[PDB]
Design an enzyme around this catalytic site. Structure first.
Site, PDB file in Angstrom:
ATOM      1  CD  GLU A   1      10.155  70.903   8.803  1.00 43.42           C
ATOM      2  OE1 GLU A   1       9.507  71.606   9.607  1.00 43.42           O
ATOM      3  OE2 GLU A   1      11.364  70.632   8.964  1.00 43.42           O
ATOM      4  CG  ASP A   2      12.040  74.247   4.511  1.00 43.55           C
ATOM      5  OD1 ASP A   2      11.647  75.398   4.794  1.00 43.55           O
ATOM      6  OD2 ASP A   2      13.025  73.709   5.060  1.00 43.55           O
ATOM      7  CB  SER A   3       6.081  71.510   1.546  1.00 41.23           C
ATOM      8  OG  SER A   3       5.056  71.936   2.418  1.00 41.23           O
TER       9      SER A   3
ATOM     10  CG  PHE B   1       7.852  67.592   3.875  1.00 39.54           C
ATOM     11  CD1 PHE B   1       7.777  66.215   3.925  1.00 39.54           C
ATOM     12  CD2 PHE B   1       7.402  68.317   4.948  1.00 39.54           C
ATOM     13  CE1 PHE B   1       7.247  65.579   5.027  1.00 39.54           C
ATOM     14  CE2 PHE B   1       6.878  67.692   6.051  1.00 39.54           C
ATOM     15  CZ  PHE B   1       6.795  66.321   6.093  1.00 39.54           C
TER      16      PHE B   1
END
Ligand SMILES: [Mg+2]
Ligand SMILES: [Zn+2]
Ligand SMILES: [Zn+2]
Ligand SMILES: [Zn+2]
Ligand SMILES: [Zn+2]
Lengths: 77, 240, 240, 115, 98, 98, 254, 44, 66, 35, 526
Positions: free
Chosen positions: K204-206, C159
RNA sequence: UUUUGGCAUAGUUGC
């Protein structure tokens, strides 16, 4: 004189449930005792568990021949 | 759900303190680097005096490069091992590595101890200038820092030459990512368009569109790949 | 020329027969959601109100579809069209005629996509079976596709700005096909390497590594809080 | 665009019940209270007060989804004491506690201002 | 008259040449605007500097896409005139082919 | 018009022979943030050409020390072909050798 | 099986913040009280900005957003005021809102500062709290800002403009006796201002029978409410929420 | 039909038929006057 | 563009301190001393006055379109 | 007499500030066009 | 070299290269050569002296500038060809001091190594502590960052423009930013960021964001889009006229409203418009008449900010209408540090829900811990620590890359003086339960950038609508709408699924169904 | 009273 497997393939289950759910959606008669079931897919699954679906699968062997299996005849996985 | 809700009580982070080693560990790493540089200078002196002898199958440049490369590799992994031994149990880098969630032991060694040799096309940094990697070195200098062995960790920060050689190293990563994406699909579309029509017929044989036997049974056993699993034959290895 | 029209990547046979634009498809940015089951996908309200599914009128759903027809397009959940037995199409954002709002068995109502609808969900590049999988729609009040975290690694998605595509099967038979063949719980084990394609991922994997340590102790209120999130719990608190 | 209105996190719309009780069939003398348009403010405090009760065999709460506004409180009790009774008694205890705290805070304010 | 030449902004011939920041504000021009671009039909166009091999210099390479062991290229070009550059090569034939 | 078209479209060479013309020399200036404007104005483009196929230009070469940025390049199919000048780098404007 | 007997001790009370300690309470009640300080104390803040003329350099939504963030004196009026959504009017009568009027024309050459001083209320009890004053916008010669706006009762859960607190410090177990946090190196951590250890210890000795208690608060008001008023209104609002929940539960059981 | 000259800020009533030019400075860029409709923003 | 009204993190009023902050800086105060004199103890509040860039002063150089 | 190392950090950035005050960032485009 | 260094007959940019081994002296004077200034070194001593620094300190009111430095023969331009014949010192402080000799013959000395970086890479704080691919990723993302792109943006009418409400200069800055004018036109906001695992929406890269901060204008932005249009006269084939189309006189229209416009066929500024409303009523004469009025894009919405009318090059009336749209950060909007930590907003929590320190500070943003380790963006952590030190000390921190006067030990010792843990960690309290979080969270100010890629600009869906004229399939036009290509990859993916019915439904039923009539005897469509 | 549309390029950018 049947040589194919006696088990319903996953593809056979998918297409049988799809067609029977479509038929039930078109006000087809229902061969199982339902209770407040509205979704045609759930009614079709109940029929499949009851082995009451009135469909015959025509499996084509790779020589032009074929075998006609009743849905009740096959082993539901 | 359960683990994510328990983590609000536990909590997990990553910070500067997780990338810091004790002073003894830094002294050990510096001693290892000094020893590695000294023996690289020894190898260079042996090569310059024609005392280094080529190994069978390799020229003298290849022999020298293999020697210095193995030297710097063992130095790097020894420093990384020593940094790993310095890690506490509360160290969040170790927590994320041992769980396999992210990172690797090499990442911890690079962050803490030594980023290591920077390589271009599988070799040390080449002489772009006249027998030099940069204008800041003397000609015919095969030392570690001259040919792109960066000795500072990411915590300690790289020097200008080290930074430039690291950028050169990462450029190949970006380029080979680009060419991988360029070759994405092409091999796959060629394979599928060769094989898309192959199917398991109702006689359990595997046949193509033109109905030619490819396999009499799929995978030579008739079993799907979904529900097979690794086991050990108990009678192969034991003696009589 | 005519030869140029058919050759190449954007020809009629490779740009408009093997692949082509399709109706009933949406795309947007993906974001995480640990509170969804792995077979659930969050959907924005606008996308759900824009996309439709043809529901055949039966005496079981006559009242429900009549209510949806009464709502129309202005209000979600509603409907776009009524396709009568003759095939003529009545639009619902322009027609207040109550005679046209009569329904009977055999009519089809293109109702707005609602909760529990089956949708194929995809990330390009599509590299294996798990790159397109069936999910159940969950309407959530924001402008992104919310996903469970475990289903990111089959899609190879993160994301950081990734977009993903969502196709809606428009027929009961296709819906059953996706239900029985392509639902992501059925796609847990890949036949590529006879192993699970998705496992436990970053935060929950680190946190369950820390959780199952020998010295993790939880008092009464903490475990009573955690067991709320356990869906399969039989309701018996175990002996401490 | 799809942003929900800010008011629909504490406001009940038409025909929405504030609180709904459902017996849990898995275990005797267990109930689930679904309270709409609430958050951890009431969930955590009611859970803590229920845990103080000696006849409560289980008391827990969860928000099913943060973007949605519901709290599901599961309360299981001994066979001689209903979960509804425990819930009401917990709320009355909290109300008495906060009233006493209001009184003592007012007294402390008056003392500090006079002092 | 023979035509009209586009003018790079803030050059020696743009009207904003050597103007103080006050006057740039009076003309509603940002004093921090660096210039260095043209305005074509109102669109701001910038010329990207094009890299190309240097001229008039001997470069000896070793091709093996051909029958030559080596090749001395020299992209000779005139000075300030006659933009078409003449590229001569002097090659050594490969001794492998015989 | 001849200059104007070439600056409006970025096709360089004869207009009627634009089939074999080098494209993308002139680009619309990227006004999203001031840093992007400055980065676009200080940009170098290396075309593929015949010579780029002889030796790989995408890799960061040693001579690029101090002249172009060591770490600045678009991803995708443009890595190492589009570069940006270093801060104090200045390009010779040319002079007469007499 | 019943309520604790919480005890209050006010340590400091200024006109901008109140510091106090609550003993004999569970953690959940204290945390919910802090939560209610932040997000459930109603105040009066500007909403419904109607702009008649805005020739300033800042666009209209910018000015309206800045006006919304101005705190307004709502010490004693907010309790008797009603939420506009519940009132029976055109949404703006004196029983659910307070009108504001701004009309600034910059005629002199010098830069004109549009401050909160220029906001004229129709009710004297509700003014900007600074009446240095909060700068809204700077105007040039020939520029004009002219608008009218109202101020409704809301609380911080709806929008942060209605949050009355400028940071609520909350603490418990300053010596980490319960070991709810586990310092890898406890010596490195500075002592909290409420710590009671000497300068040879780092943590209190571990207490297995301990329970959270003696919660230290420091509620700093933005200005719209006195800090003591913030705490009293907070406790009243939480009690009101619980009583309403009891009413609905009694109706459901019946 | 009032416009404001971009240069000298003169209000000019210009019909839909005639060319647009400042009636006291000759400047050729005109901005429409602000609308007299009712405009409201919530201060969020 | 202009000084924000609230501190983004804690919500403290900061818009009524920019001119005073600049006035203290004209009085030869270190920026830390100026922020301490204005009573910003939490570094969240200090960050906003310390890092604010006042572009409205530059935007007011352009004459208004009236 | 000469720049001591402790003061070199100030000296070099003074030089670079003078460089950018004289030249600016777009000398390339402007000088090429003027030539 | 004597003549060049004196600015005699040889100009500065002329480059002389002596190949001693080949006995050649190549002098180059043509354009296109790249060079850079280097300090001249003689007998292991800089020719730069304290007198030059004193003269440059009074650069104003002395008329001593860089050109006098070049004329004095202290600094000279060296090109990459001549660099091959140059022995260059990295820093004068150590590289040429007497010691165990490495090289006793230095010809030049670098001014500062940090000038090797470009423009977008020079805003990275501590880039020498990062992995180089992330330096590249930041060099792109800084190009993509929102900010005040120019001070005269009010008068300009560009097709797309993004302007941040409250941009801030970074608390941790590089010296080179002083010359990029980044301090005057910053692009980003200093954000109190806590690197912590939390409820699970940062994974997750948020990013988790503070909703109350956004309510206070945190990263709030405005998006300007300008529509241009011109009425033309092409002989007597037709004629376009600006006027509101009336429902009776034009036989071609759309269902959108036409009362927003004025009598001149133009919408007044300060009027809200949806994605289908008309803004320029333009009517083309029919040889009655037809309309060719322009509407907003289908997804867009906003208020008409400014409407200019003028004459084009041909003397034809034409107008440009700027449309303001206020963008608030929401779920899906991208954010990034100055270290390649790209990430979307996973969820927004109110201030009470965020975790908080003992002093009531809630982080503006929470990022996942796992975004760091494989990244090895240690510069991000050093930026956070230095920013905390800067904000407490009240002094803009320095993050010039190759500076040895600053390192993590000194920063930690400075931070410990302000009553904080020396490594920046803090004891955070769970916002929901109020309990202390067991591990201590790394938190502090960090400079973040909102990238232009909002979710509302990349969300679209289709049920049915504007098909092609030739292929009779969905196509893109008037918006992103027009369906998504069910490419060969998706085709074979569904073939592997065995989902023949769904594959047929995608490719035939729900893309372009058709039916033809063909003779049975022959095979041609009859 | 129920419409709608330029095609082919070139550049830039996201995964
Ligand atoms: Mg991605
Ligand atoms: Zn009222
Ligand atoms: Zn005029
Ligand atoms: Zn603050
Ligand atoms: Zn025929």
């Amino acid at each position: 004189k049947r040589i194919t497997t006696p088990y319903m393939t996953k593809y056979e289950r998918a297409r049988v449930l799809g067609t029977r759910a479509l038929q039930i959606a078109m006000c087809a008669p229902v061969m199982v005792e339902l209770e407040g079931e509205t979704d045609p897919l759930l009614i079709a699954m109940k029929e499949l568990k009851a082995r009451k679906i009135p469909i015959i699968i025509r499996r084509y062997l790779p020589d032009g021949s074929y075998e006609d299996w009743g849905v009740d005849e096959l082993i539901i996985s | 759900t359960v683990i994510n809700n328990w983590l609000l009580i536990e909590g997990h982070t990553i910070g500067i303190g997780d990338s810091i080693a004790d002073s003894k560990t830094y002294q050990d790493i510096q001693n290892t680097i000094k020893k590695a540089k000294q023996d690289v200078i020894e190898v260079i002196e042996k090569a310059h005096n024609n005392e280094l002898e080529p190994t069978p199958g390799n020229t003298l440049r290849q022999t020298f490069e293999n020697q210095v490369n193995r030297i710097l590799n063992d130095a790097r992994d020894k420093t990384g091992s020593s940094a790993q031994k310095s890690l506490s149990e509360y160290n969040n880098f170790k927590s994320m590595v041992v769980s396999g969630a992210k990172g690797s032991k090499i990442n911890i060694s690079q962050v803490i101890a030594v980023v290591g040799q920077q390589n271009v096309e599988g070799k040390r940094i080449p002489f772009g200038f006249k027998h030099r990697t940069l204008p800041h070195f003397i000609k015919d200098d095969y030392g570690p820092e001259s040919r792109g062995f960066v000795e500072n960790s990411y915590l300690a920060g790289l020097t200008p030459t080290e930074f430039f050689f690291h950028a050169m190293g990462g450029r190949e990563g970006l380029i080979d990512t680009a060419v991988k994406t360029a070759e994405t699909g092409y091999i796959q579309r060629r394979l599928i368009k060769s094989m898309e029509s192959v199917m398991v017929k109702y006689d359990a044989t595997v046949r193509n569109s033109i109905n030619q036997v490819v396999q009499l049974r799929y995978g030579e056993d008739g079993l799907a790949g979904e529900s097979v699993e690794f086991q050990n034959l108990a009678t192969l290895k034991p003696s009589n | 020329s005519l030869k140029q029209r058919l050759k190449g990547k954007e020809g009629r046979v490779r740009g408009n027969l093997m692949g082509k634009r399709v109706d009933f498809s949406a795309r947007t940015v993906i974001t995480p959601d640990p509170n969804l089951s792995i077979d659930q996908v969050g959907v924005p309200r606008s996308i759900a109100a824009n996309m439709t599914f043809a529901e055949i009128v039966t005496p079981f759903n006559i009242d429900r579809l009549q209510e949806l027809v009464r709502r129309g397009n202005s209000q979600y959940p509603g409907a776009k069209y009524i396709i009568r037995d003759n095939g003529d199409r009545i639009d619902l954002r322009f027609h207040p005629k109550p005679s046209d709002l009569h329904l009977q068995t055999g009519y089809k109502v293109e109702r707005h996509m609602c909760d529990g609808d089956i949708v194929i969900f995809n990330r390009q590049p599509t590299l294996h079976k798990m790159s397109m999988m069936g999910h159940r729609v969950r309407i959530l009040p924001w402008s992104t596709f919310r996903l469970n975290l475990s289903v990111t690694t089959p899609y190879n998605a993160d994301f950081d700005g990734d977009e993903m595509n969502l196709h809606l099967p428009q027929s009961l038979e296709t819906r059953a096909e996706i239900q029985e063949l392509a639902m992501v719980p059925r796609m847990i084990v890949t036949p590529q390497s006879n192993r699970p394609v998705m496992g436990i991922v970053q935060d929950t994997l680190t946190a369950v590594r820390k959780f199952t340590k020998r010295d993790v102790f939880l008092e009464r209120g903490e475990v009573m809080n955690l067991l709320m999130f356990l869906s399969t719990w039989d309701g018996k608190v175990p002996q401490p | 665009m799809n942003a929900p209105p800010a008011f629909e996190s504490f406001l009940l719309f038409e025909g929405e019940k504030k609180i709904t009780i459902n017996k849990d069939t898995k275990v005797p003398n267990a109930c689930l209270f679904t309270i709409n348009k609430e958050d951890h403010t009431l969930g955590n405090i009611i859970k803590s007060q229920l845990l103080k009760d000696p006849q409560v065999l289980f008391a827990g709460y969860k928000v099913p989804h943060p973007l949605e506004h519901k709290i599901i409180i599961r309360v299981q009790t001994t066979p001689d004491y209903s979960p509804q009774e425990a819930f009401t008694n917990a709320i009355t205890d909290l109300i008495s506690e906060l009233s006493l705290l209001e009184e003592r805070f007012r007294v402390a304010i008056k003392d500090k201002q006079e002092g | 008259f023979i035509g009209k030449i586009p003018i790079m902004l803030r050059s020696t011939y743009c009207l904003l040449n050597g103007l103080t920041d006050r006057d740039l504000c009076e003309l509603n021009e940002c004093p921090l605007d660096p210039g260095g671009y043209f305005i074509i039909n109102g669109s701001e166009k910038v010329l990207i500097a094009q890299e190309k091999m240097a001229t008039n210099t001997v470069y000896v390479f070793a091709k093996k896409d051909s029958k030559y062991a080596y090749t001395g290229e020299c992209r000779s070009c005139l000075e300030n005139s006659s933009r078409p550059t003449s590229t001569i090569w002097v090659s050594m034939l490969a001794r492998g082919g015989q | 018009d001849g200059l104007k078209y070439s600056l409006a479209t970025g096709n360089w060479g004869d207009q009627k022979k634009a089939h074999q013309a080098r494209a993308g020399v002139s680009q619309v200036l990227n006004r999203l943030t001031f840093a992007s404007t400055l980065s676009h104005l200080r940009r170098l483009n290396s075309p593929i050409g015949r010579d780029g196929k002889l030796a790989k230009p995408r890799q960061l070469h040693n001579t690029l020390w101090g002249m172009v940025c060591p770490a600045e390049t678009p991803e995708g199919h443009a890595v190492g072909l589009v570069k940006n000048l270093a801060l104090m780098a200045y390009i010779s404007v040319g002079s007469q050798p007499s | 099986p019943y309520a604790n007997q919480p005890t209050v001790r006010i340590t400091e009370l200024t006109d901008e913040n109140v510091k106090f300690i609550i003993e004999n309470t569970d953690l959940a009640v204290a945390n919910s009280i802090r939560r209610v300080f932040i997000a459930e104390v109603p105040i009066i803040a500007i909403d419904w900005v109607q702009i008649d003329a805005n020739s300033s350099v800042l666009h209209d939504e910018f000015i309206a957003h800045r006006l919304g963030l101005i705190p307004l004196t709502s010490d004693d009026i907010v309790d008797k005021l009603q939420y506009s959504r519940d009132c029976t009017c055109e949404e703006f009568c004196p029983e659910c809102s307070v009108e504001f009027t701004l009309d600034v024309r910059c005629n002199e050459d010098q830069t004109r500062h549009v401050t909160s001083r220029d906001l004229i209320s129709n009710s004297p009890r509700v003014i900007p709290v600074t009446s240095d004053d909060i700068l809204i916008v700077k105007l040039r010669k020939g520029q004009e800002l002219r608008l009218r706006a109202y101020a409704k009762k809301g609380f911080g859960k709806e929008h942060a403009k209605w949050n009355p607190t400028a940071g609520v410090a909350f603490e418990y177990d300053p010596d980490n006796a319960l070991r709810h946090t586990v310092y890898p190196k406890p010596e490195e951590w500075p002592k909290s201002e409420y710590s009671e250890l000497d300068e040879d210890e780092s943590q209190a000795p571990y207490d297995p029978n301990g329970k959270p208690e003696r919660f230290y608060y420091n509620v700093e008001s933005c200005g719209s409410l006195r800090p003591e008023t913030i705490v009293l209104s907070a406790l009243s609002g939480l009690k009101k929420k619980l009583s309403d929940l009891q009413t609905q539960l009694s109706h459901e059981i019946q | 039909m009032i416009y404001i000259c971009g240069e000298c800020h003169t209000e000019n009533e210009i019909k839909s038929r005639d060319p647009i030019r400042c009636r006291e400075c000759g400047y050729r860029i005109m901005y429409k006057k602000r609308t007299k409709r009712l405009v409201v923003f919530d201060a969020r | 563009m202009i000084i924000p009204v609230r501190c983004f993190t804690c919500g403290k009023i900061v818009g009524n301190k920019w001119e005073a902050y600049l006035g203290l800086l004209q009085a030869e105060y270190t920026e830390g001393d100026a922020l301490d004199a204005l009573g910003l103890k939490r570094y969240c509040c200090r960050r906003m006055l310390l890092a604010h860039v006042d572009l409205i002063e530059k935007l007011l150089n352009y004459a208004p379109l009236e | 007499d000469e720049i001591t190392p402790d003061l070199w950090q100030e000296a070099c950035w003074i030089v670079i500030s003078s460089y950018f005050d004289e030249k600016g960032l777009v000398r390339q485009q402007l000088d090429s066009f003027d030539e | 070299r004597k003549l060049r260094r004196q600015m005699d007959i040889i100009v500065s940019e002329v480059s002389m290269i002596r190949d001693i081994r080949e006995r050649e002296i190549r002098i180059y004077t043509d354009a296109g050569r790249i060079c850079r200034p280097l300090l001249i070194v003689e007998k292991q001593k800089l020719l730069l002296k304290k007198r030059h620094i004193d003269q440059l300190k009074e650069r104003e009111y002395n008329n001593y500038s860089w050109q006098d430095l070049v004329a004095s023969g202290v600094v000279e331009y060296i090109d990459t060809l001549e660099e091959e014949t140059v022995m260059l010192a990295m820093t004068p402080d150590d590289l040429q001091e007497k010691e165990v000799a490495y090289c006793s013959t230095y010809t030049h000395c670098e001014i500062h190594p940090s000038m090797i970086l470009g423009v977008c890479a020079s805003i990275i704080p501590f880039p020498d502590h990062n992995q180089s691919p992330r330096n590249t990723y930041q060099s792109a993302m800084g190009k993509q960052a929102m900010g005040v792109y120019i001070t005269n943006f009010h008068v300009r009418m560009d097709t797309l423009a993004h302007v941040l409400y409250y941009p801030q200069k970074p608390l941790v800055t590089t010296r080179s930013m002083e010359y990029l004018r980044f301090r005057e036109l910053p692009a980003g906001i200093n954000s109190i960021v806590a690197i912590a695992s939390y409820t699970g929406y940062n994974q997750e890269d948020s990013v988790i964001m503070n909703r109350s901060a956004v309510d206070r204008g945190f990263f709030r932005s405005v998006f300007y889009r300008s529509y241009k249009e011109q009425e033309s006269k092409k002989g007597f084939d037709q004629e376009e006229v600006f006027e509101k189309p009336t429902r009776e006189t034009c036989q071609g229209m759309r269902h959108a409203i036409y009362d927003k416009l004025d009598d001149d066929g133009l919408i007044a500024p300060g009027v809200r418009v949806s994605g289908d409303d008309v803004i320029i009523g333009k009517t083309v004469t029919l040889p009655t008449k037809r309309d060719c009025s322009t509407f907003l894009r289908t997804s867009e919405t906003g208020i008409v900010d400014q409407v200019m009318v003028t004459l084009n090059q041909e003397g034809y009336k034409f107008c440009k209408i700027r449309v303001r749209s206020v963008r608030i950060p929401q779920i899906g909007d991208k954010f990034a540090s100055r270290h390649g930590q790209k990430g979307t907003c996973g969820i927004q929590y109110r201030q009470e829900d965020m975790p908080f320190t003992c002093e009531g500070i809630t982080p503006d943003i929470i990022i996942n811990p796992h975004a760091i380790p494989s990244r090895m963006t240690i510069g991000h952590l050093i930026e956070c620590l230095q920013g905390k030190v800067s904000a407490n000390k009240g002094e803009i921190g320095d993050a010039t890359p190759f500076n040895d006067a600053v390192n993590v030990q000194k920063i930690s010792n400075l931070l410990s003086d302000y009553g904080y843990h020396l490594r920046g960690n803090e004891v955070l309290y769970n916002g929901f339960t109020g309990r202390k979080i067991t591990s201590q969270i790394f938190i502090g100010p960090t400079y973040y950038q909102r990238l232009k890629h909002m979710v509302d600009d990349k969300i679209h869906s289709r049920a049915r609508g504007p098909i092609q004229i030739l292929n009779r399939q969905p196509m893109e036009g008037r918006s992103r709408d027009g369906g998504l290509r069910f490419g060969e990859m998706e085709r074979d993916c569904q073939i592997a699924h065995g989902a023949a019915q769904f594959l047929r439904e995608r490719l035939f039923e729900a893309s372009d169904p058709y039916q033809v009539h063909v003779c049975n005897l022959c095979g041609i469509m009859a």
